[PDB]
């Protein structure tokens, strides 16, 4: 991705967009009970903690576009992935406005807490005022679609979240590029059934895990993998995507029956954004807050891995490439050992910056013992080995419990953390609960004991 130009929104007929300048994150009742070093991300250029220009830092993710056209290796990757998706018999029919708005099997209703984007954010009109779950009324939306149309500017917001001291000082805050409610709705009508098919089929056929439930899905992953695992991290995946990758995605959609609306992908590829009082045009780069962002990033990841394997290992049998992606995150396998370092070398030529899995200093062999997916390790249950525990290290959990964004949600926040933590074992889980109950706020919470969560886990299969 590359920013073509940027300048005052008034010069192109757009208004100044207001965005909060203060974080909602504040120390929680457990701030001094657990260890942690993360703090709220910088949200404004005048943050005292900054040690470099803010705006330059937040837009530096657009490293440019390395490739222009789709080459032979990419075309082969497209044919293979599309062929694989064809076995799913995905309903290519457009989804009706009602379901696209309020959900159906395999697709949750539109989130009412998220931004409605332009022009609603500038008119002070919110989602609450447009849709109603109890009625499932589409009349208001339809009128708004007819009035403002589609392909509207995406509104940029700085993401309010925790980050390492370094990322804070370097102004490396992540951004939310929110599609207008009109575009979100239009894209869900266009691809709603595709989204549902992926959500209902996490695995090695879709090569996707979006919509998955880790507590249950972890036991299914090992059986789908080939003998030798391989993986790697990407540096700024979304923003590094060149226009050619969007064209390859369109080719896949055409081959599976959605050639009808590949134009929606152009909206993602060549897009314009509003940030404060400026407007900018980007060539390439996947927007972070658009309908289908995670699914399309996942599909493209399937294309990327296939392309690099074909380019690096002529004669590779892609029918034995078994991979599962969640956006840029991926767990992959092949019957034979492959060199991730070599694949990373080939990736540079395609505009992708690939590094050792989980921040390793060097590319090491990936094993069931050290592999992670969505930050979770895989550990067989001591009593019933066929049941696989998704294990997220206590470090992330401790960092999280030390802050709050609304005291009213303390109970939900802590329970969510308990659902992740117990997989670390009874000894660790009990220590976690004891620390929580060392302060008044923690003692007033209703939290499940270990045996309760273990029994609930067994009963969920
Ligand atoms: Na873009």
Tab-separated table of C-alpha atoms and ligand atoms in Angstrom:
chain	number	residue	atom	x	y	z
A	1	UNK	CA	0.000	0.000	0.000
A	2	UNK	CA	1.057	3.566	-0.753
A	3	UNK	CA	-0.474	6.955	-0.001
A	4	UNK	CA	-0.814	8.754	-3.365
A	5	UNK	CA	-1.637	12.140	-1.865
A	6	UNK	CA	-2.903	13.790	1.298
A	7	UNK	CA	-4.305	17.227	2.004
A	8	UNK	CA	-6.995	19.431	3.650
A	9	UNK	CA	-10.396	17.789	3.342
A	10	UNK	CA	-12.016	21.161	2.611
A	11	UNK	CA	-10.066	21.224	-0.659
A	12	UNK	CA	-11.920	18.118	-1.874
A	13	UNK	CA	-15.330	18.913	-0.418
A	14	UNK	CA	-15.234	17.032	2.889
A	15	UNK	CA	-15.695	18.243	6.504
A	16	UNK	CA	-13.291	18.003	9.445
A	17	UNK	CA	-13.838	14.792	11.417
A	18	UNK	CA	-13.780	14.912	15.211
A	19	UNK	CA	-12.011	12.153	17.128
A	20	UNK	CA	-11.440	11.766	20.904
A	21	UNK	CA	-7.984	12.808	22.120
A	22	UNK	CA	-8.072	11.020	25.475
A	23	UNK	CA	-7.863	7.290	26.179
A	24	UNK	CA	-10.641	5.520	28.062
A	25	UNK	CA	-8.058	3.174	29.548
A	26	UNK	CA	-7.303	3.719	33.231
A	27	UNK	CA	-5.524	1.647	35.907
A	28	UNK	CA	-7.838	-1.059	37.262
A	29	UNK	CA	-8.245	-2.347	40.813
A	30	UNK	CA	-5.627	-4.938	39.894
A	31	UNK	CA	-3.005	-2.554	38.503
A	32	UNK	CA	-0.568	-3.181	41.365
A	33	UNK	CA	-1.596	-6.794	41.969
A	34	UNK	CA	-0.173	-8.113	38.699
A	35	UNK	CA	2.965	-7.368	36.699
A	36	UNK	CA	2.751	-5.537	33.386
A	37	UNK	CA	4.542	-2.904	31.303
A	38	UNK	CA	2.067	-1.860	28.593
A	39	UNK	CA	0.303	1.540	28.488
A	40	UNK	CA	-2.401	3.230	26.379
A	41	UNK	CA	-1.331	4.007	22.816
A	42	UNK	CA	-0.622	7.595	21.809
A	43	UNK	CA	-3.822	9.076	20.374
A	44	UNK	CA	-2.655	12.620	19.547
A	45	UNK	CA	0.474	14.264	18.128
A	46	UNK	CA	0.910	16.293	21.326
A	47	UNK	CA	1.346	13.329	23.669
A	48	UNK	CA	4.245	14.046	26.094
A	49	UNK	CA	5.571	10.490	25.770
A	50	UNK	CA	6.214	10.821	22.013
A	51	UNK	CA	9.838	10.794	20.856
A	52	UNK	CA	9.144	11.280	17.143
A	53	UNK	CA	6.593	12.839	14.787
A	54	UNK	CA	3.225	11.146	15.361
A	55	UNK	CA	1.550	11.364	11.962
A	56	UNK	CA	4.726	10.256	10.193
A	57	UNK	CA	4.765	7.221	12.485
A	58	UNK	CA	1.142	6.126	12.067
A	59	UNK	CA	1.286	6.280	8.261
A	60	UNK	CA	4.732	4.696	7.893
A	61	UNK	CA	2.989	1.315	7.601
A	62	UNK	CA	2.365	2.061	3.930
A	63	UNK	CA	5.746	0.766	2.752
A	64	UNK	CA	4.791	0.984	-0.909
A	65	UNK	CA	3.815	-1.449	-3.644
A	66	UNK	CA	6.452	-3.949	-4.740
A	67	UNK	CA	4.531	-5.580	-7.599
A	68	UNK	CA	2.110	-4.357	-10.256
A	69	UNK	CA	0.777	-7.366	-12.170
A	70	UNK	CA	-0.287	-10.910	-11.305
A	71	UNK	CA	2.456	-13.340	-12.430
A	72	UNK	CA	2.325	-17.026	-13.398
A	73	UNK	CA	2.912	-18.283	-9.865
A	74	UNK	CA	0.071	-16.122	-8.530
A	75	UNK	CA	-2.217	-17.334	-11.320
A	76	UNK	CA	-1.472	-20.948	-10.392
A	77	UNK	CA	-2.116	-20.175	-6.711
A	78	UNK	CA	-5.456	-18.625	-7.713
A	79	UNK	CA	-6.491	-21.702	-9.716
A	80	UNK	CA	-5.580	-24.088	-6.907
A	81	UNK	CA	-7.285	-22.171	-4.075
A	82	UNK	CA	-10.400	-21.454	-6.143
A	83	UNK	CA	-10.651	-25.120	-7.085
A	84	UNK	CA	-10.463	-26.036	-3.417
A	85	UNK	CA	-13.196	-23.521	-2.511
A	86	UNK	CA	-15.428	-24.944	-5.259
A	87	UNK	CA	-15.855	-28.147	-3.248
A	88	UNK	CA	-17.809	-26.172	-0.640
A	89	UNK	CA	-20.754	-25.376	-2.941
A	90	UNK	CA	-20.916	-21.799	-1.671
A	91	UNK	CA	-24.260	-20.094	-2.326
A	92	UNK	CA	-23.354	-17.337	-4.812
A	93	UNK	CA	-26.703	-15.618	-4.365
A	94	UNK	CA	-26.790	-12.072	-3.024
A	95	UNK	CA	-27.982	-11.789	0.579
A	96	UNK	CA	-31.133	-9.769	1.283
A	97	UNK	CA	-30.816	-6.425	3.081
A	98	UNK	CA	-32.534	-7.666	6.245
A	99	UNK	CA	-30.173	-10.581	6.859
A	100	UNK	CA	-27.164	-8.467	5.882
A	101	UNK	CA	-28.220	-6.008	8.585
A	102	UNK	CA	-29.544	-8.226	11.369
A	103	UNK	CA	-27.813	-11.524	10.661
A	104	UNK	CA	-28.667	-15.090	9.742
A	105	UNK	CA	-27.108	-18.542	10.105
A	106	UNK	CA	-23.347	-18.085	9.868
A	107	UNK	CA	-23.423	-14.284	10.035
A	108	UNK	CA	-23.866	-12.164	13.148
A	109	UNK	CA	-25.868	-8.949	13.001
A	110	UNK	CA	-24.019	-5.688	12.387
A	111	UNK	CA	-22.223	-4.475	15.520
A	112	UNK	CA	-24.195	-1.527	16.923
A	113	UNK	CA	-21.304	-0.217	19.017
A	114	UNK	CA	-18.926	0.491	16.124
A	115	UNK	CA	-18.686	3.659	14.023
A	116	UNK	CA	-21.276	4.355	11.331
A	117	UNK	CA	-18.593	6.202	9.383
A	118	UNK	CA	-19.106	8.985	6.839
A	119	UNK	CA	-21.319	10.968	6.457
A	120	UNK	CA	-23.184	9.848	9.587
A	121	UNK	CA	-20.312	10.685	11.937
A	122	UNK	CA	-20.414	14.254	10.611
A	123	UNK	CA	-24.220	14.483	10.812
A	124	UNK	CA	-24.270	13.227	14.389
A	125	UNK	CA	-26.429	10.284	13.319
A	126	UNK	CA	-25.669	6.938	14.976
A	127	UNK	CA	-26.508	3.304	14.232
A	128	UNK	CA	-29.023	3.195	17.089
A	129	UNK	CA	-31.041	5.690	15.038
A	130	UNK	CA	-30.940	3.543	11.888
A	131	UNK	CA	-31.462	-0.107	12.793
A	132	UNK	CA	-33.609	-1.866	15.371
A	133	UNK	CA	-33.058	-5.524	16.278
A	134	UNK	CA	-36.613	-6.119	17.516
A	135	UNK	CA	-38.204	-4.940	14.259
A	136	UNK	CA	-35.428	-5.793	11.813
A	137	UNK	CA	-36.558	-2.685	9.937
A	138	UNK	CA	-34.724	-2.064	6.664
A	139	UNK	CA	-36.760	0.939	5.506
A	140	UNK	CA	-34.501	3.554	7.088
A	141	UNK	CA	-31.319	1.900	5.778
A	142	UNK	CA	-32.702	1.555	2.260
A	143	UNK	CA	-33.500	5.268	2.227
A	144	UNK	CA	-29.970	6.088	3.390
A	145	UNK	CA	-28.512	3.843	0.692
A	146	UNK	CA	-30.556	5.626	-1.969
A	147	UNK	CA	-29.558	9.029	-0.614
A	148	UNK	CA	-25.806	8.693	-0.046
A	149	UNK	CA	-24.954	5.715	-2.255
A	150	UNK	CA	-21.743	3.724	-1.865
A	151	UNK	CA	-17.956	3.973	-2.203
A	152	UNK	CA	-17.767	6.611	0.533
A	153	UNK	CA	-14.563	7.782	2.270
A	154	UNK	CA	-13.420	5.575	5.153
A	155	UNK	CA	-13.054	7.324	8.529
A	156	UNK	CA	-9.712	6.903	10.272
A	157	UNK	CA	-9.525	6.556	14.063
A	158	UNK	CA	-6.512	5.801	16.230
A	159	UNK	CA	-7.113	2.539	18.081
A	160	UNK	CA	-7.440	2.972	21.851
A	161	UNK	CA	-5.454	-0.004	23.197
A	162	UNK	CA	-2.398	-0.985	25.240
A	163	UNK	CA	1.111	-1.037	23.773
A	164	UNK	CA	4.770	-1.467	24.721
A	165	UNK	CA	6.719	1.564	25.939
A	166	UNK	CA	8.710	1.425	22.702
A	167	UNK	CA	5.666	1.512	20.431
A	168	UNK	CA	4.311	4.374	22.542
A	169	UNK	CA	7.513	6.383	22.232
A	170	UNK	CA	7.792	5.649	18.501
A	171	UNK	CA	4.180	6.702	17.975
A	172	UNK	CA	3.464	3.288	16.478
A	173	UNK	CA	-0.282	3.349	17.173
A	174	UNK	CA	-2.574	1.159	15.073
A	175	UNK	CA	-5.400	2.719	13.061
A	176	UNK	CA	-9.044	1.867	12.430
A	177	UNK	CA	-10.155	2.598	8.858
A	178	UNK	CA	-13.938	2.413	9.223
A	179	UNK	CA	-16.138	1.832	6.200
A	180	UNK	CA	-19.329	3.864	5.993
A	181	UNK	CA	-22.415	1.956	7.152
A	182	UNK	CA	-23.600	2.119	3.521
A	183	UNK	CA	-20.540	0.269	2.229
A	184	UNK	CA	-20.576	-2.253	5.071
A	185	UNK	CA	-24.220	-3.073	4.298
A	186	UNK	CA	-23.658	-3.203	0.535
A	187	UNK	CA	-20.657	-5.518	0.913
A	188	UNK	CA	-22.557	-7.799	3.276
A	189	UNK	CA	-25.379	-8.122	0.733
A	190	UNK	CA	-22.824	-8.888	-1.951
A	191	UNK	CA	-20.704	-11.366	0.019
A	192	UNK	CA	-22.937	-12.369	2.918
A	193	UNK	CA	-23.250	-15.999	1.855
A	194	UNK	CA	-19.489	-16.248	1.290
A	195	UNK	CA	-18.898	-14.972	4.841
A	196	UNK	CA	-21.400	-17.481	6.212
A	197	UNK	CA	-19.765	-20.387	4.332
A	198	UNK	CA	-16.367	-19.458	5.789
A	199	UNK	CA	-17.719	-18.944	9.316
A	200	UNK	CA	-19.349	-22.375	9.205
A	201	UNK	CA	-16.340	-24.130	7.697
A	202	UNK	CA	-13.195	-23.127	9.617
A	203	UNK	CA	-10.400	-25.449	8.515
A	204	UNK	CA	-8.084	-26.464	5.669
A	205	UNK	CA	-10.598	-26.254	2.839
A	206	UNK	CA	-11.432	-22.580	3.333
A	207	UNK	CA	-7.921	-22.233	4.753
A	208	UNK	CA	-9.564	-19.939	7.291
A	209	UNK	CA	-10.365	-19.880	10.974
A	210	UNK	CA	-12.430	-16.687	11.132
A	211	UNK	CA	-15.484	-17.275	13.348
A	212	UNK	CA	-13.863	-20.204	15.153
A	213	UNK	CA	-14.254	-21.189	18.830
A	214	UNK	CA	-10.739	-22.056	20.108
A	215	UNK	CA	-11.977	-24.158	23.053
A	216	UNK	CA	-13.458	-26.605	20.534
A	217	UNK	CA	-11.516	-25.944	17.320
A	218	UNK	CA	-8.096	-26.673	18.837
A	219	UNK	CA	-8.958	-30.365	19.096
A	220	UNK	CA	-9.753	-30.393	15.369
A	221	UNK	CA	-6.637	-28.649	13.985
A	222	UNK	CA	-3.980	-31.367	14.543
A	223	UNK	CA	-5.859	-33.977	12.506
A	224	UNK	CA	-6.066	-31.600	9.529
A	225	UNK	CA	-2.313	-30.862	9.431
A	226	UNK	CA	0.341	-32.679	7.400
A	227	UNK	CA	3.488	-34.043	9.085
A	228	UNK	CA	5.787	-31.005	8.978
A	229	UNK	CA	4.604	-27.643	10.304
A	230	UNK	CA	5.887	-24.270	9.142
A	231	UNK	CA	4.935	-20.689	10.011
A	232	UNK	CA	6.186	-17.111	10.158
A	233	UNK	CA	5.076	-13.611	11.149
A	234	UNK	CA	4.420	-10.676	8.830
A	235	UNK	CA	5.439	-7.083	9.496
A	236	UNK	CA	2.544	-4.770	8.673
A	237	UNK	CA	0.716	-7.338	6.517
A	238	UNK	CA	-2.450	-5.339	5.680
A	239	UNK	CA	-0.658	-2.149	4.654
A	240	UNK	CA	2.042	-4.000	2.702
A	241	UNK	CA	-0.427	-5.625	0.285
A	242	UNK	CA	0.167	-4.512	-3.325
A	243	UNK	CA	-2.653	-3.933	-5.838
A	244	UNK	CA	-1.791	-7.207	-7.610
A	245	UNK	CA	-2.896	-9.213	-4.571
A	246	UNK	CA	-6.333	-7.576	-4.734
A	247	UNK	CA	-6.540	-8.508	-8.430
A	248	UNK	CA	-5.661	-12.120	-7.610
A	249	UNK	CA	-8.441	-12.131	-5.004
A	250	UNK	CA	-10.885	-10.871	-7.641
A	251	UNK	CA	-9.819	-13.763	-9.889
A	252	UNK	CA	-10.698	-16.217	-7.122
A	253	UNK	CA	-14.101	-14.580	-6.584
A	254	UNK	CA	-14.781	-14.692	-10.331
A	255	UNK	CA	-13.966	-18.400	-10.449
A	256	UNK	CA	-16.282	-19.256	-7.553
A	257	UNK	CA	-19.304	-17.357	-8.854
A	258	UNK	CA	-18.994	-13.842	-7.417
A	259	UNK	CA	-17.449	-12.317	-10.552
A	260	UNK	CA	-20.669	-10.371	-10.364
A	261	UNK	CA	-19.305	-8.001	-7.740
A	262	UNK	CA	-15.519	-7.885	-7.882
A	263	UNK	CA	-15.938	-4.097	-8.081
A	264	UNK	CA	-16.316	-4.107	-4.291
A	265	UNK	CA	-12.742	-5.307	-4.037
A	266	UNK	CA	-11.563	-2.248	-5.984
A	267	UNK	CA	-13.114	-0.163	-3.180
A	268	UNK	CA	-10.698	-1.846	-0.755
A	269	UNK	CA	-7.654	-1.641	-3.076
A	270	UNK	CA	-7.985	1.961	-4.290
A	271	UNK	CA	-9.550	3.775	-1.332
A	272	UNK	CA	-9.812	7.292	0.119
A	273	UNK	CA	-9.684	8.177	3.798
A	274	UNK	CA	-10.612	11.006	6.170
A	275	UNK	CA	-8.376	11.678	9.179
A	276	UNK	CA	-9.185	14.756	11.249
A	277	UNK	CA	-9.013	17.656	8.782
A	278	UNK	CA	-7.219	15.742	6.012
A	279	UNK	CA	-8.217	13.425	3.181
A	280	UNK	CA	-5.902	10.909	1.528
A	281	UNK	CA	-5.814	8.400	-1.318
A	282	UNK	CA	-4.232	4.963	-0.897
A	283	UNK	CA	-3.215	2.524	-3.652
A	284	UNK	CA	-3.145	-1.012	-2.262
A	285	UNK	CA	-3.359	-1.829	1.447
A	286	UNK	CA	-6.305	-3.584	3.102
A	287	UNK	CA	-8.501	-1.206	5.181
A	288	UNK	CA	-8.697	-2.392	8.804
A	289	UNK	CA	-12.370	-1.618	9.425
A	290	UNK	CA	-14.263	-2.824	6.391
A	291	UNK	CA	-16.838	-5.579	6.068
A	292	UNK	CA	-14.955	-8.790	5.307
A	293	UNK	CA	-11.499	-7.432	6.159
A	294	UNK	CA	-10.492	-10.568	8.083
A	295	UNK	CA	-11.973	-12.991	5.537
A	296	UNK	CA	-10.372	-11.277	2.533
A	297	UNK	CA	-7.008	-10.967	4.317
A	298	UNK	CA	-7.314	-14.707	5.048
A	299	UNK	CA	-8.117	-15.576	1.413
A	300	UNK	CA	-5.165	-13.508	0.212
A	301	UNK	CA	-2.903	-15.215	2.762
A	302	UNK	CA	-3.879	-18.533	1.155
A	303	UNK	CA	-2.836	-17.087	-2.227
A	304	UNK	CA	0.443	-15.695	-0.869
A	305	UNK	CA	1.628	-18.942	0.741
A	306	UNK	CA	0.766	-20.933	-2.380
A	307	UNK	CA	2.598	-18.421	-4.593
A	308	UNK	CA	5.759	-18.464	-2.487
A	309	UNK	CA	5.799	-22.277	-2.365
A	310	UNK	CA	5.396	-22.464	-6.174
A	311	UNK	CA	8.083	-19.826	-6.731
A	312	UNK	CA	10.521	-21.389	-4.277
A	313	UNK	CA	9.750	-25.086	-4.797
A	314	UNK	CA	8.745	-25.948	-8.365
A	315	UNK	CA	6.932	-29.297	-8.324
A	316	UNK	CA	5.401	-28.685	-4.888
A	317	UNK	CA	2.091	-30.543	-4.422
A	318	UNK	CA	-0.362	-27.901	-3.201
A	319	UNK	CA	-2.944	-30.612	-2.620
A	320	UNK	CA	-0.820	-31.441	0.406
A	321	UNK	CA	-0.393	-27.908	1.651
A	322	UNK	CA	-2.675	-27.810	4.705
A	323	UNK	CA	-3.007	-24.340	6.185
A	324	UNK	CA	-5.374	-22.216	8.259
A	325	UNK	CA	-5.198	-18.432	8.349
A	326	UNK	CA	-6.858	-15.747	10.469
A	327	UNK	CA	-5.984	-12.574	8.645
A	328	UNK	CA	-2.182	-12.467	8.592
A	329	UNK	CA	-1.824	-15.120	11.309
A	330	UNK	CA	-1.268	-18.653	10.018
A	331	UNK	CA	-0.514	-22.248	10.935
A	332	UNK	CA	0.615	-24.331	7.949
A	333	UNK	CA	2.010	-27.756	7.117
A	334	UNK	CA	3.401	-29.950	4.310
A	335	UNK	CA	4.568	-33.602	4.215
A	336	UNK	CA	8.144	-32.385	3.749
A	337	UNK	CA	10.284	-29.869	5.567
A	338	UNK	CA	10.449	-26.404	3.996
A	339	UNK	CA	12.752	-23.454	4.687
A	340	UNK	CA	10.823	-20.473	6.063
A	341	UNK	CA	13.932	-18.332	5.638
A	342	UNK	CA	13.866	-19.043	1.895
A	343	UNK	CA	10.136	-18.432	1.673
A	344	UNK	CA	10.702	-15.085	3.412
A	345	UNK	CA	13.324	-14.223	0.802
A	346	UNK	CA	10.830	-14.937	-1.992
A	347	UNK	CA	8.179	-12.948	-0.131
A	348	UNK	CA	10.191	-9.710	-0.279
A	349	UNK	CA	9.849	-9.772	-4.061
A	350	UNK	CA	6.077	-9.862	-3.616
A	351	UNK	CA	6.080	-6.944	-1.169
A	352	UNK	CA	5.761	-9.008	2.007
A	353	UNK	CA	8.088	-8.746	5.009
A	354	UNK	CA	8.220	-12.138	6.740
A	355	UNK	CA	10.027	-12.880	10.018
A	356	UNK	CA	10.539	-15.890	12.351
A	357	UNK	CA	7.411	-17.275	14.015
A	358	UNK	CA	6.483	-15.626	17.327
A	359	UNK	CA	9.315	-13.078	17.275
A	360	UNK	CA	12.166	-15.610	17.098
A	361	UNK	CA	15.619	-14.210	16.288
A	362	UNK	CA	16.189	-16.901	13.672
A	363	UNK	CA	13.967	-19.196	11.613
A	364	UNK	CA	13.642	-22.354	13.715
A	365	UNK	CA	11.747	-25.586	13.131
A	366	UNK	CA	8.071	-25.318	14.076
A	367	UNK	CA	6.782	-28.178	16.237
A	368	UNK	CA	3.535	-29.001	18.034
A	369	UNK	CA	5.381	-28.029	21.183
A	370	UNK	CA	6.325	-24.485	20.138
A	371	UNK	CA	3.696	-23.489	17.563
A	372	UNK	CA	1.087	-20.820	18.332
A	373	UNK	CA	-2.058	-19.679	16.519
A	374	UNK	CA	-3.933	-16.593	17.730
A	375	UNK	CA	-1.319	-16.395	20.511
A	376	UNK	CA	-2.357	-19.810	21.838
A	377	UNK	CA	-0.165	-22.915	22.209
A	378	UNK	CA	-1.593	-26.437	21.790
A	379	UNK	CA	-1.522	-28.793	24.796
A	380	UNK	CA	-3.181	-32.199	25.047
A	381	UNK	CA	-5.315	-32.701	28.158
A	382	UNK	CA	-3.658	-34.858	30.815
A	383	UNK	CA	-6.698	-37.084	31.354
A	384	UNK	CA	-8.201	-37.129	27.842
A	385	UNK	CA	-5.279	-36.636	25.346
A	386	UNK	CA	-7.597	-36.332	22.343
A	387	UNK	CA	-8.950	-33.072	23.816
A	388	UNK	CA	-6.617	-30.176	22.971
A	389	UNK	CA	-6.268	-27.101	25.202
A	390	UNK	CA	-5.724	-23.692	23.561
A	391	UNK	CA	-3.123	-22.177	25.933
A	392	UNK	CA	-2.593	-18.434	26.041
A	393	UNK	CA	0.313	-17.479	28.344
A	394	UNK	CA	-0.559	-15.636	31.547
A	395	UNK	CA	1.602	-12.666	30.495
A	396	UNK	CA	-0.996	-11.216	28.064
A	397	UNK	CA	-3.789	-11.850	30.543
A	398	UNK	CA	-1.906	-10.066	33.335
A	399	UNK	CA	-1.234	-7.083	31.054
A	400	UNK	CA	-4.953	-6.900	30.270
A	401	UNK	CA	-6.444	-7.185	33.755
A	402	UNK	CA	-4.363	-4.191	34.934
A	403	UNK	CA	-6.481	-1.715	32.967
A	404	UNK	CA	-10.169	-0.946	32.494
A	405	UNK	CA	-12.229	1.004	29.961
A	406	UNK	CA	-15.458	1.051	31.974
A	407	UNK	CA	-15.845	-0.030	35.615
A	408	UNK	CA	-19.335	-1.280	34.744
A	409	UNK	CA	-17.787	-4.049	32.619
A	410	UNK	CA	-15.244	-5.217	35.205
A	411	UNK	CA	-17.173	-8.447	35.778
A	412	UNK	CA	-17.382	-9.307	32.051
A	413	UNK	CA	-13.771	-8.302	31.434
A	414	UNK	CA	-12.416	-10.484	34.234
A	415	UNK	CA	-14.634	-13.465	33.357
A	416	UNK	CA	-13.401	-13.261	29.758
A	417	UNK	CA	-9.841	-13.416	31.050
A	418	UNK	CA	-10.674	-16.429	33.250
A	419	UNK	CA	-11.981	-18.282	30.177
A	420	UNK	CA	-8.527	-17.888	28.653
A	421	UNK	CA	-6.416	-18.436	31.778
A	422	UNK	CA	-7.736	-21.724	33.187
A	423	UNK	CA	-6.210	-23.645	30.281
A	424	UNK	CA	-2.846	-22.926	31.913
A	425	UNK	CA	-3.679	-25.476	34.598
A	426	UNK	CA	-5.337	-25.665	38.010
A	427	UNK	CA	-2.305	-24.491	39.993
A	428	UNK	CA	-1.860	-21.377	37.842
A	429	UNK	CA	-5.578	-20.655	37.651
A	430	UNK	CA	-6.006	-20.798	41.434
A	431	UNK	CA	-3.094	-18.378	41.927
A	432	UNK	CA	-4.780	-16.030	39.450
A	433	UNK	CA	-8.088	-16.180	41.337
A	434	UNK	CA	-6.366	-15.702	44.714
A	435	UNK	CA	-4.627	-12.508	43.529
A	436	UNK	CA	-7.887	-11.205	42.074
A	437	UNK	CA	-9.575	-11.824	45.428
A	438	UNK	CA	-6.805	-9.963	47.275
A	439	UNK	CA	-8.644	-6.669	46.657
A	440	UNK	CA	-12.284	-5.594	47.310
A	441	UNK	CA	-13.267	-5.274	43.634
A	442	UNK	CA	-12.061	-8.821	42.995
A	443	UNK	CA	-13.829	-10.287	46.020
A	444	UNK	CA	-17.158	-8.899	44.797
A	445	UNK	CA	-16.903	-10.655	41.401
A	446	UNK	CA	-18.682	-13.907	40.527
A	447	UNK	CA	-15.958	-16.058	38.930
A	448	UNK	CA	-15.929	-19.779	38.041
A	449	UNK	CA	-13.638	-22.202	39.845
A	450	UNK	CA	-11.327	-24.551	37.939
A	451	UNK	CA	-13.373	-27.762	38.224
A	452	UNK	CA	-16.386	-25.788	36.998
A	453	UNK	CA	-14.584	-24.666	33.838
A	454	UNK	CA	-13.050	-28.106	33.204
A	455	UNK	CA	-16.443	-29.809	33.508
A	456	UNK	CA	-18.039	-27.169	31.290
A	457	UNK	CA	-15.268	-27.758	28.718
A	458	UNK	CA	-15.850	-31.533	28.600
A	459	UNK	CA	-19.595	-30.931	28.299
A	460	UNK	CA	-19.161	-28.555	25.345
A	461	UNK	CA	-17.899	-31.129	22.825
B	1	LIG	NA1	-6.464	0.488	0.087
